[PDB]
RNA sequence: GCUAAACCUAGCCCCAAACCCCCACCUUACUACCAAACCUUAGCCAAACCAUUUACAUAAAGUAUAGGCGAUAGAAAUUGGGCGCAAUAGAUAUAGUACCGCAAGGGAAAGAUGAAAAAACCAAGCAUAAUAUAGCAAGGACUAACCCCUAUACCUUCUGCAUAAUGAAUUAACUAGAAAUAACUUUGCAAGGAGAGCCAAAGCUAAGACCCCCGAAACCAGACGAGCUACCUAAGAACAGCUAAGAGCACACCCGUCUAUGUAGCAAAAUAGUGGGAAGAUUUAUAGGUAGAGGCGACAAACCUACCGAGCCUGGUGAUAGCUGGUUGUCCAAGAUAGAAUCUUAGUUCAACUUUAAAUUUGCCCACAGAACCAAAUCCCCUU
RNA sequence: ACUGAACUCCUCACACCCAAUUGGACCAAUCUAUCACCCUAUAGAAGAACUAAUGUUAGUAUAAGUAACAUGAAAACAUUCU
RNA sequence: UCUCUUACUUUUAACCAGUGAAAUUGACCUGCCCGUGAAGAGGCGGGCAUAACACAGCAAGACGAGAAGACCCUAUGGAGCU
């Protein structure tokens, strides 16, 4: 009987942290700063994708060029697994063509 | 599992509790019991038109029941009440044959009486005067 | 279905019609957020037609709480001490004024 | 696992008034984990299931099956119990209202087959539940008696409306 | 787990209706809950008659004498019911015996006497009075309302309004609920 | 959205650790079809249509709407009567019980965003005061953004950070198309 | 997707692949359409109603000589060296109602595009631009940001 | 054709269509017509005049060839004698 | 009221940073001590077969080139902490353990008190409480459960299924639409747009919105297997009694002719009776050897660790499938059948039909007149 | 002559009976932003919904208390007997 | 062996006590006749029959259970051989 019989303890989101109270600040640095910093240069997670979006099989080409040089023994077959698959199936499978 | 469903058993009593009073598992079993709750409700939907099918068959063997008393058939009664302009319909009629008989047997009287006011005028054809109870009221 | 679902006949409470009319409400009772958008309309229904609704019959004793509710309700209690309680959740102002109305 | 049936004899009414008849001691009983079928225990549990304690005693010594000499161990201490602890005086005026058989947590085996095929043997294991209720037993229901079915007969006749009309 | 708290709070709400529906609690009288006022109650008690009484005068024929003694029983921890109740009940005696030997003159005063203990019975008036919250309105001490002293506040309703009213707005309160019954 | 980069990855079946051969063969027992017990249909297989990888959703809007939603929610706050204009954010002291009480006594809000001219040439009281407080938050003049005007029930200006905005915004109206970008040097820009 | 064919299961064949017979983009012969298209010379037009309107908009002051660069700071015509454009041609596209005396150096140049400018007292001369030496005339600021 | 490449991840264009196939900016596809070399001498000359012409391509098959081709290959290019050069713009359609 | 239910933190995923780690043991590993490594990957698959061929910062650019010039492949100059999972999830992991296999190898499951143990209500399934003429198990009803009247389960596949066609005991949980240019919608700015590169004869930039799941027999690469079995090698052993030599009768032994039992069995090939050989080309214990493009073979295309027309395991591998099955909230709207090509007729492309959005002006029905020489009708056609 | 439909009329109300496909209006639950504060609002997002794959795993049914399974005898439980 | 089968013993059997599987299974409140129908009906049509319930046999039916028919044909699916 997947329900669960007593109500959870209740989630305290405090709307005023730090991460909360200054959020967004800094996103305008280009146009209200002299344009020396564009608002792609704030934005901090992979090396292969600070400041691009691409789909799955534009991510792992990109992946296995900008940071495959140092990957994993098992983590770049793996990839070479996933970019022959994604090849596969975005340029032979599919409705439209 | 990012976001599985947490509320599949309220969409489950939405069709059992319908189902409560059914026989075997289809009133436990959710799988036996939607594809009788839909059949169950299908089932209600055509049969309103079996219900106002089957009151007038009934009004019909109540009137052809009671007409039979006064020594009418049923087609004797309804195509000469409705040469007196008598527009009663067939729920008064079965209505009025069990729980006011005198004015059933007014009716049955009226109907017989225009019956052969209709004969007279048949079997003497040529221009004769039309019949007291046959004469129709116009409206302009 | 009606095989399924209770059922009863057709009657009035007290021979409704006979002598006089009696007004069959006693009491409505809204909840009603004063900070919460499910309660926009019933916030414009109290402010706007819940005076000009509790002239027009004065039987029904209005009861207007005004708690901090996430979902407004509508309790209309009826003379023969029946409890219809409904929802006035996300609704307009003109789809309260035909709720109570119908209650 | 639940154990309601243990809790049921600590049920404390309020104390009873002069104006009032006397209430009957209620006696819940019960042994788990029973290494017998649960539906080879409805047998046994049918059968003393209107009876004073006293019979359910005798038909009990004298059955051939195993669970017989387990259900004759539970209502003896149900009986010393109610003398005991529930305040019963008569050992002799008790009858056993409610014996059921629930099902207990089974253990699960491997049972080989003809091949390399097999089977999966499964210990059963049941509870006894009883409940003794202190007075006389009821009698019996008799057969209703060709009046009693008359009137029921005449009672449905008398009862019909005129159905589709006013 | 599934995360998440929509469903959890519903199944805490069907989970108090099926507490109820195996475990009812005890009745508990109107005055006891939210959402009343016990003066805003009476003056919608007039009007939804269709009528209008003295709302002081009122207000004693709900009291009855049980109250005024378990008023007192708690204050070691007003006026009674039996004046305006008497005026009702002997006035509603001769009024519908007035209005039954009119319509039906053939009659014998046994069965008159006879229609009129079943008009005033506790069978049609506690009926009566159930369906024109009286018993929401009525101070007794012991809940649900017994039939012998909601009888007694029917009545002095009656005789509350003769008061206020006069014997022919009277009359036509004893017309409408119980000659209708 | 732009600077969101979620972290959610599934293993796929081609991931998830062993399932290499047929459980059983293609036709003999009457159980199913199967090929590997890592398959979506499988208890502990992989995820058919899962997330995979770290996903950026990083798209720039044209500079030219982003200084519109600038323009646009500095109107919104001068119409909805949330703009407060000052000459400089000076104190006369650093307590946070000082700010508090007046912004509870011009019946400002319960957010205040305040916005000086320039990080490092902020007043020593006034940084003193709003570090400790949540909701009264000192920005420089680069860091003001519509999101957090938003977050904010007032917004307060200075009288040097008021011109900042009509010559950088001003500047995006009445400005030709980029030859390269403006980080570069040109004749009038910087 | 549809009933079960090759449709539903995803696998139909390549585009332009007709059925199995030749199909129409293989049926036709091959001709030097676009044989040599990335060793053409290609040129931007510069209209005379073009070169006219910038002369009155003070984007283009033709007090000056004006040369490839001052049609691009005042962004009047956009080039680019990769897509191989050599330059700036003069057109004679509104050679009637153009008044500047003016001192212009596009690439190619028509007849009576130089016709309009040289009946007004200006100069037209014809210069040669390398895709090197475009590159840097057209944004001068990022060849001076390379340190060569 | 390969809608998502391996190296780039981008179109690629089939180059059979490049071949054969001549793109007007207006979005006519213009080419020579089959067999126009093959077998001239058993076909009258009024055959073989309508084969040495330049005719345009379908809907169907402009935008078949339009989708096997990139955005490079639909963009303005001001050559310096292009003989189709007054082809390119579209003058006085009504649609 | 039993069975059960519920729970939240173990841990994990993705990134960022920073480059990680006493004794005995290569002989039969866990045993104190004696006379030689380097040698192209292939193939699935794509080409709708297949045989050359087929991918392993930004920008130039999917351009030059390459190519059964065809599927497709493709440069360079130059430019410069969490809108993660929370015990069927997340690692396979409580653990590479238990268990399975000779081995390589495969590979699990699961736990929940409280501050201190030195203190209820909800699945299936049953029970409480077996059943009463009659029929997709209900519905219309009814005073009334049934009696009366009406009603040929669902999914899938199809010309068409109550179909005696497919699937399903049932409950809980898990389990299936991933994206391009072009168009459209909505903004920004506008002969210019865009935070360089690119497009532009109203464009350009940004957003939104369309492309599934399971399943072969196979193919190849590299390991692991000759403790069963086929044959061989080494050095062993066994064969009563009776008649007189790959002799006869006959045990032990080995083999398995025929019958019966057994057929989820005692047994994934056996038991009981009967039978063939049993001093030999015999049977057999032990250790070794030959290995899958092969071994071995008194050829049965037998046997090579229970399935050998080519072992088994891991890898390529999420092989491929025009073939089957499956494809999960609600409501409304429009919506059916000319054909042609095709190693193609189980499929696809184009047309036709259908759908949406847009622009415009005719569409359908039709009257005289008219449409060829060697029947019914149609075509054309203003009015209406 | 009467009977007889979902046809047609009547009282009220109307977007509310086709496969593949296509267009459209809504939306459960989750997380995030900000609100809300007995369970919600407007948006942003996505592992976002199962009466069906001889689906996977766990529980429990049915067949079924069925098929099948076991201990030579007496006794002083020393022993003896078959 | 049969004409032509019969008797007895043992195992099984059936009953009592203990232990306790399996394939199977849409739901079943599970009749017969003739007709119908995807062309052979417990279920539809017209009739006929009909209190409810075990236990033992039987094998005519449930196109009985088992094993995604090996026959045949199809696939621009495989493989062995020459
Ligand atoms: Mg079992
Ligand atoms: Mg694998
Ligand atoms: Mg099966
Ligand atoms: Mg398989
Ligand atoms: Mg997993
Ligand atoms: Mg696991
Ligand atoms: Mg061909
Ligand atoms: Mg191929
Ligand atoms: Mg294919
Ligand atoms: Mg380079
Ligand atoms: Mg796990
Ligand atoms: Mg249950
Ligand atoms: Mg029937
Ligand atoms: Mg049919
Ligand atoms: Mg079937
Ligand atoms: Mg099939
Ligand atoms: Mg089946
Ligand atoms: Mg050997
Ligand atoms: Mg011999
Ligand atoms: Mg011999
Ligand atoms: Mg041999
Ligand atoms: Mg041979
Ligand atoms: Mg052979
Ligand atoms: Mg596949
Ligand atoms: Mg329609
Ligand atoms: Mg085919
Ligand atoms: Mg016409
Ligand atoms: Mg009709
Ligand atoms: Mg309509
Ligand atoms: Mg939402
Ligand atoms: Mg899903
Ligand atoms: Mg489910
Ligand atoms: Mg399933
Ligand atoms: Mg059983
Ligand atoms: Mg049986
Ligand atoms: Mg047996
Ligand atoms: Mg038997
Ligand atoms: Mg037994
Ligand atoms: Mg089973
Ligand atoms: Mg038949
Ligand atoms: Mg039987
Ligand atoms: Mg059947
Ligand atoms: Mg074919
Ligand atoms: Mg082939």
């Given at each position: 009987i997947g329900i669960r019989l007593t109500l959870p303890p209740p989630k305290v989101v405090d709307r005023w942290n730090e991460k909360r109270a200054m959020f967004g600040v800094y996103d305008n640095i280009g146009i209200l700063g002299n344009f020396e910093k564009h608002p792609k240069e704030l934005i901090r997670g992979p090396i292969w994708l600070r400041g691009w979006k691409g789909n799955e099989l534009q991510r792992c080409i990109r992946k296995r060029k900008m940071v495959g040089s140092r990957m994993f023994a098992d983590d770049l077959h793996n990839l070479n697994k996933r970019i022959r698959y994604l090849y596969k199936h975005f340029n032979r499978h599919g409705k439209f063509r | 599992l990012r976001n599985r469903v947490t509320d599949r058993y309220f969409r489950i009593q939405e069709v059992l509790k319908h189902a409560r009073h059914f026989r075997g598992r289809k009133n436990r079993c959710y799988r036996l019991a939607v594809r009788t709750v839909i059949r169950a409700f299908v089932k209600c939907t055509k049969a309103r038109y079996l219900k106002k099918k089957n009151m007038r068959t009934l009004w019909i063997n109540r009137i052809t029941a009671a007409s039979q008393e006064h020594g009418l058939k049923y087609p004797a009664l309804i195509g000469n009440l409705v040469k007196c302009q008598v527009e009663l319909n067939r729920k008064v009629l079965a209505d009025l044959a069990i729980y006011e008989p005198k004015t059933f047997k007014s009716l049955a009287a009226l109907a017989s009486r225009r019956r052969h006011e209709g004969f007279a005028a048949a079997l003497g054809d040529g221009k004769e005067p039309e019949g007291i109870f046959s004469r129709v009221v116009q409206y302009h | 279905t009606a095989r399924g679902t209770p059922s009863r006949f057709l009657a009035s409470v007290l021979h409704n019609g006979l002598g006089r009319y009696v007004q069959q409400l006693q009491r409505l009772s809204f909840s009603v957020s004063r900070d919460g958008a499910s309660s926009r309309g019933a916030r414009e229904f109290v402010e706007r037609e819940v005076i000009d609704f509790a002239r027009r019959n004065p039987g029904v004793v209005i009861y207007v709480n005004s708690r901090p509710c996430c979902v407004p309700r509508v309790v209309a209690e009826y003379l023969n001490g029946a409890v219809r309680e409904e929802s006035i959740h996300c609704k307009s102002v003109e789809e309260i004024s035909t709720l109570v109305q119908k209650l | 696992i639940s154990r309601k049936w243990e809790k049921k004899n600590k049920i404390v009414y309020p104390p009873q008034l002069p104006g009032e008849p006397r209430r009957p001691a209620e006696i819940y009983h019960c042994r788990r984990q029973i290494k017998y079928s649960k539906d080879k225990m409805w047998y046994l549990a049918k059968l003393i299931r209107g009876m004073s304690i006293d019979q359910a005693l005798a038909q009990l010594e004298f059955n051939d099956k195993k669970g017989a000499k387990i259900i004759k161990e539970v209502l003896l201490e149900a009986q010393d119990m109610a003398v005991r602890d529930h305040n019963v005086e008569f050992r002799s005026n008790l009858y056993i209202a409610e014996s059921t058989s629930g099902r207990g947590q089974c253990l699960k085996r491997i049972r080989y087959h003809g091949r390399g095929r097999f089977g999966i043997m499964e210990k059963v294991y049941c509870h006894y539940f009883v409940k003794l209720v202190e007075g006389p037993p009821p009698p019996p229901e008799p057969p209703k008696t060709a009046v009693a079915h008359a009137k029921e007969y005449i009672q449905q006749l008398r009862s019909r409306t005129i159905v589709h009309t006013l | 787990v599934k995360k998440g708290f929509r469903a959890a709070f519903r199944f805490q709400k069907e989970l108090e209706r099926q507490r109820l529906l195996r475990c009812p609690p005890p009745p508990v009288r109107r005055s006891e809950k939210p959402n009343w006022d016990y003066h805003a109650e009476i003056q919608a008690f007039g009007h939804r008659l269709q009528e209008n009484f003295s709302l002081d005068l009122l207000k004693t024929?709900?009291?009855?004498?049980?109250?005024?003694?378990?008023?007192?029983?708690?204050?070691?921890?007003?006026?009674?019911?039996?004046?305006?109740?008497?005026?009702?009940?002997?006035?509603?005696?001769?009024?519908?015996?007035?209005?039954?030997?009119?319509?039906?003159?053939?009659?014998?005063?046994?069965?008159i006497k006879n229609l009129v203990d079943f008009l005033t019975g506790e069978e049609v008036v506690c009926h009566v009075a159930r369906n024109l919250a009286v018993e929401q309105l009525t101070l007794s001490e012991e809940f649900p309302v017994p039939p012998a002293v909601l009888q007694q506040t029917f009545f002095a309703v009656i005789g509350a309004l003769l008061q206020s009213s006069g014997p022919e707005r009277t009359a036509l309160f004893i017309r409408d609920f119980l000659i209708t019954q | 959205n732009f600077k969101r980069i979620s972290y959610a990855k599934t293993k796929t079946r081609a991931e998830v650790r062993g399932g290499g051969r047929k459980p059983w063969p293609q036709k003999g027992t009457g159980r199913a079809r199967h090929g590997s017990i890592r398959s979506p249909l499988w208890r502990g297989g992989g995820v058919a249509h899962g997330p995979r990888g770290p996903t950026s959703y990083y798209y720039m809007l044209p500079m030219k709407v982003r200084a519109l939603g600038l323009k646009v929610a500095l109107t919104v706050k001068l119409a909805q009567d949330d703009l407060h204009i000052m000459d400089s954010l000076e104190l006369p002291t650093g307590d946070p019980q000082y700010l508090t009480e007046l912004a509870h006594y011009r019946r400002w809000g319960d957010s205040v965003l305040l916005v000086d001219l320039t990080h490092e040439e902020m007043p020593q009281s006034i940084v003193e005061a709003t570090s400790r407080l949540k909701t009264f938050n000192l920005i420089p003049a680069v860091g003001l953004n519509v999101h957090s005007m938003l977050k904010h029930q007032t917004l307060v200006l200075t009288l040097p950070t008021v011109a900042f905005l009509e010559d950088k915004l001003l500047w995006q109206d009445s400005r030709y198309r980029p030859l390269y970008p403006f980080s570069l040097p040109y004749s009038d820009f910087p | 997707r549809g009933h079960k064919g090759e449709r539903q299961r995803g696998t139909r064949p390549r585009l332009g692949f007709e059925g199995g017979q030749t199909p129409f983009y293989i049926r036709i012969p091959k001709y030097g359409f676009n044989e040599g298209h990335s060793f053409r010379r290609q040129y931007k037009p510069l209209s005379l109603n073009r070169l006219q309107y910038l002369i009155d908009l003070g984007r283009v002051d033709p007090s000056q000589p004006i040369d490839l660069t001052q049609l691009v700071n005042g962004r009047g015509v956009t080039i680019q060296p990769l897509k191989r454009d050599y330059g700036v041609q003069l057109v004679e596209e509104g050679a009637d109602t153009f008044t500047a005396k003016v001192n212009i150096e596009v690439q190619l140049a028509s007849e009576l595009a130089i016709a309009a400018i040289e009946k007004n007292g200006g100069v037209v001369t014809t210069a040669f631009y390398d895709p090197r030496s475009l590159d840097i005339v057209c944004k001068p600021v990022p060849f001076f940001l390379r340190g060569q | 054709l390969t809608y998502f490449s391996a190296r780039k991840g981008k179109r690629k264009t089939v180059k059979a269509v490049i071949d054969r196939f001549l793109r007007l900016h207006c979005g006519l596809w213009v080419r020579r017509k089959a067999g126009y070399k093959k077998k001239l001498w058993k076909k009258t000359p009024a055959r073989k005049k309508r084969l040495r012409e330049f005719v345009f391509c379908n809907k169907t098959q402009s935008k078949l060839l339009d989708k096997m081709t990139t955005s490079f290959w639909k963009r303005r290019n001001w050559y310096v004698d292009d003989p189709y050069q007054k082809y390119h713009d579209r003058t006085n359609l009504k649609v």
């Open positions: - | - | - | - | 024929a709900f009291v009855n004498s049980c109250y005024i003694k378990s008023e007192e029983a708690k204050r070691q921890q007003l006026k009674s019911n039996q004046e305006l109740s008497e005026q009702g009940t002997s006035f509603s005696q001769t009024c519908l015996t007035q209005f039954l030997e009119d319509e039906y003159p053939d009659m014998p005063t046994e069965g | - | - | -």
